[PDB]
């Protein structure tokens, strides 16, 4: 994951 | 959503709730989206990149609650899952973070507008409001960065558009933020989107109309000083959108 993702799986 | 208020689908009738069916029969929330025409929901590519199979996904419209039914919701299957060819993820951010889902019910029908279901308008190409414009975001995302559970009731809040000039300062994002992206935040840093809000709409009033101005993409933390939400700049993707949907 990118460090700043707001994706629920991250 | 950090801060802001609980709401219902009626106040955000284009919001789509997107779920993934698991191999053990369990079904879990993936991301938000927006209804831009009856057969089409727009969202973020990063939501679907790890599991690219359109058969794993269910889209609900008219839905105010995350794990329980709302009267008036409609369930849809995904007929195609169109991800951006140029999507990419950095150590920090996402690029070209946009996706399209063409929806049909098991009855082959597309969305019927409702008290609880309405489409949202796309902006004119390269047309955006000015920095400092108040806009609305909606989602089922965490209410605090430290939570492990998602709220059951839909939420929304208001944030202000930030200039690319201000978004690029070094103590804000720097060169990570491109012109394919829009930043927005609370002037006091008290409200913001968060994990589980991604794919969801940033909605602004642009020349009278409620317009879909961005798609929740990334940000460092939620409601963190000097760290605004970042969104896919919709107005910069109309041709991509028209190609894939004018079908």
Residue numbers in the entry:
A (entry chain P): 1 to 10
B (entry chain U): 16 to 37, 37A, 37B, 37C, 37D, 38 to 60, 60A, 60B, ...
Question: How do the authors describe this structure?
Answer:
While being unable to generate crystals of muPA, we did manage to crystallise huPA-H99Y, a murinised version of human uPA which, in contrast to human uPA wt, is able to bind mupain-1, although with a somewhat lower affinity than muPA. In the complexes, the inhibitory peptides adopt cyclic conformations with an overall Ω shape.
Beginning from the N-terminus, the cyclic peptides approach the active site of huPA-H99Y from the 99-loop, insert residue 6 into the S1 pocket, and exit the active site towards the 37-loop. In the enzyme-peptide structures, the peptides are constrained by two type I tight β-turns (Pro2-Ala3-Tyr4-Ser5 and Tyr7-Leu8-Asp9-Cys10) and three intra-peptide H-bonds (Pro2 O – Ser5 N; Seri5 Oγ - Tyr7 N; Ser5 Oγ - Arg6 N). Moreover, the distance from the oxygen atom of the carbonyl group of the P1 residue to the amido group of the Ser195 is too large (approximately 4 Å) for formation of a polar interaction, implying that oxyanion stabilisation cannot take place.
